[PDB]
Amino acid sequence: DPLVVAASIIGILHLILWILDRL
Amino acid sequence: DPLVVAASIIGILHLILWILDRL
Amino acid sequence: DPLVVAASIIGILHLILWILDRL
Amino acid sequence: SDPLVVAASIIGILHLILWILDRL
Ligand SMILES: C[C@H](N)[C@]12C[C@H]3C[C@H](C[C@H](C3)C1)C2
């Protein structure tokens, strides 16, 4: 499902940003 | 599956909100 | 997939916790 | 079995762990 695939990419991005935001 | 679809929408929302919370 | 169903529930939970902490 | 979706699932579970530990 493209909605699930899109949420997958976004959740990967979210953790990257959250880690960078804590660094 | 409705639960996976719901979490997908919710994860999209989550990142939007978090980004805004930092801006 | 139990990983995907589990991450769905956990993702819903994470957003609920973020909102509560925000509110 | 989509590796994107499995990866994001694993990452989403870790994200919550980090958030909770950062909360506690
Ligand atoms: C909401 C999660 N980040 C989640 C992770 C995986 C991708 C999508 C759907 C579900 C599995 C739940 C988003």
Side-chain angles (χ1 to χ4, degrees):
Chain A
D1 191 319
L3 169 51
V4 180
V5 169
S8 300
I9 295 172
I10 274 154
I12 296 170
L13 173 61
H14 191 176
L15 181 51
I16 299 175
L17 292 180
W18 191 92
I19 290 175
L20 295 192
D21 185 61
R22 297 308 171 82
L23 291 179
Chain B
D1 181 88
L3 169 69
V4 178
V5 179
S8 296
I9 292 159
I10 280 168
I12 291 158
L13 177 68
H14 195 175
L15 172 58
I16 300 193
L17 298 177
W18 182 85
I19 283 165
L20 297 177
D21 186 88
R22 292 340 192 107
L23 298 184
Chain C
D1 195 323
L3 239 51
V4 181
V5 179
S8 298
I9 293 161
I10 285 174
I12 289 159
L13 168 65
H14 190 185
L15 172 73
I16 294 188
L17 295 183
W18 188 93
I19 287 161
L20 292 174
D21 184 282
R22 178 56 207 254
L23 294 170
Chain D
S1 174
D2 190 323
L4 256 48
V5 185
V6 172
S9 300
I10 295 163
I11 292 170
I13 292 154
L14 168 70
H15 197 177
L16 185 57
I17 298 174
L18 294 176
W19 190 94
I20 296 181
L21 298 179
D22 177 84
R23 182 59 171 74
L24 299 176

